Design a protein around this ligand. Structure first.
Ligand SMILES: [Zn+2]
Ligand SMILES: [Zn+2]
Lengths: 7, 425
């Protein structure tokens, strides 16, 4: 599963 | 003054950098973790994720999967700022006349894309879009930063690594030429590059040999990654534009001592365990931020440090203002005999086309009664001498493959030598 982290 | 941007998830909102998102494997759309009840901690446990709309038909999610010190050694040093050597020029003022006045001997930083004639995608362009237009099945060259080795893999396999939390490895893509892909239509080099490029000006349309596929590069650098010192193949000048993130450049002037040290350093098998900036006098530290464009002259030894995820576009070109340096770098590259992966294809073929153009310029100078500028005459002599070495009876077999079709080097060399002698009075 491709994910996008936070910041 | 609104504009149109993509939106994601069920809420149909633009991307939020502060919100964790996961992409559905079926509809290829990203959904906010809070919106679809997926927590970032539990994300790695999933194998295949399907959003509830896709779970209705495509089945439920497969929720069962069954060099750091070197970077610290880079900011440990106190390098001088690039403001001493790197000039800040607006894109509009970076014209052909500016290049002739200054000679392009030091790197040029253009903070704003305006005036450069550069065409790049909007900042709402992501690595997921890079995969779609380049091609998920296209094989790419991925560099293992920690191991300082290269390996080939599918682009979809690298982008899976890029969009995974808690990356165990440090992998970069710095050699990805997309001029043969759909993404090529989205990127156009700066107009100053096209004016100065030998290939853009002097490579025939009907030439049997392919043009040097060095015009459009895409770089995907992960956080806390590093690229070692190197010289671009054939001394080609380069332009770098940072679409997202930022990059730090460590530039070394191509002095005679520094070029010799680089050749001996790069030739050593343990060059990855040796910090090259120790051996040089001055190593300027330059920060290229988002939306900024950096132009690197011929022969400059540069390395990059990437503090955040960075997407950049780059291109290589040859110009007439650094003919001597380009030949010197090519000679160093030939002696090193390193891997032909980041090389400059048909470098000699461009020189033969440039030499033919110079001979036509010499004939035009005789007809127009105005001799060529001195740097062209010196560059003609430099290229003419290289032609003799390439087409010598004991060395023709090495350089015959890059010789253009219907080219008679003996006539070209003799004509150039006479024109240089005539134009030397
Ligand atoms: Zn879906
Ligand atoms: Zn949402």
């Amino acid at each position: 599963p491709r994910v996008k982290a936070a910041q | 003054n609104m504009a149109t941007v993509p939106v994601y998830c069920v809420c149909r909102l633009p991307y939020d950098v502060t919100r964790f998102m996961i992409e559905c494997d079926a509809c290829k759309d990203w959904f906010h973790g809070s919106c679809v009840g997926v927590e970032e901690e539990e994300a790695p446990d999933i194998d295949i994720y399907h959003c509830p709309n896709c779970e209705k038909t495509h089945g439920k999610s497969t929720l069962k999967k069954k060099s750091q010190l070197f970077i610290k050694e880079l900011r440990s040093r106190t390098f001088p700022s690039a403001e001493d050597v790197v000039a800040r020029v607006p894109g509009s003022q970076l014209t052909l006349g500016y290049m002739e006045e200054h000679g392009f001997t030091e790197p040029i930083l253009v903070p704003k894309k305006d005036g450069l004639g550069l065409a790049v995608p909007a900042p709402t362009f992501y690595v997921s879009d890079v995969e779609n237009y380049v091609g998920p099945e296209r094989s790419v060259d991925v560099t293992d930063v920690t191991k300082q080795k290269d390996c080939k893999m599918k682009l979809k396999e690298f982008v899976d690594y890029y969009y995974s939390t808690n990356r165990k490895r440090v992998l970069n893509v710095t050699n990805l030429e997309f001029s043969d892909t759909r993404m090529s239509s989205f990127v156009e080099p700066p107009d100053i590059v096209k004016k100065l490029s030998w290939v853009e000006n002097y490579w025939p349309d009907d030439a049997l040999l392919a043009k040097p596929k060095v015009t459009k590069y895409c770089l995907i650098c992960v956080k806390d990654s590093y690229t070692d010192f190197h010289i671009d193949s054939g001394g080609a000048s380069a332009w770098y534009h940072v679409l997202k993130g930022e990059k730090t450049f460590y530039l070394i002037r191509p002095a005679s001592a520094n070029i010799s040290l680089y050749e001996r350093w790069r030739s050593a098998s343990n060059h990855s365990e040796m910090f090259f900036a120790d051996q040089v006098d001055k190593c300027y530290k330059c920060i290229v931020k988002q939306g900024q464009t950096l132009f690197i002259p011929s022969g400059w030894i540069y390395a990059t440090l990437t503090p955040v995820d960075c997407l950049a576009f780059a291109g290589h070109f040859l110009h007439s203002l650094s003919v001597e340096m380009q030949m010197r770098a090519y000679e160093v590259e030939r002696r090193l005999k390193l891997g032909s992966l980041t090389q400059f294809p048909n470098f000699e073929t461009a020189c033969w086309y440039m030499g033919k153009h110079l001979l036509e310029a010499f004939k035009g100078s005789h007809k127009s009664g105005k001799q060529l500028p001195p740097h062209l005459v010196q560059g003609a002599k430099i290229l003419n001498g290289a032609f003799r070495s390439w087409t010598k009876k004991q060395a023709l077999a090495e350089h015959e493959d890059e010789l253009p079709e219907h080219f008679k080097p003996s006539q070209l060399i003799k004509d150039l030598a006479k024109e240089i002698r005539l134009s030397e009075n």
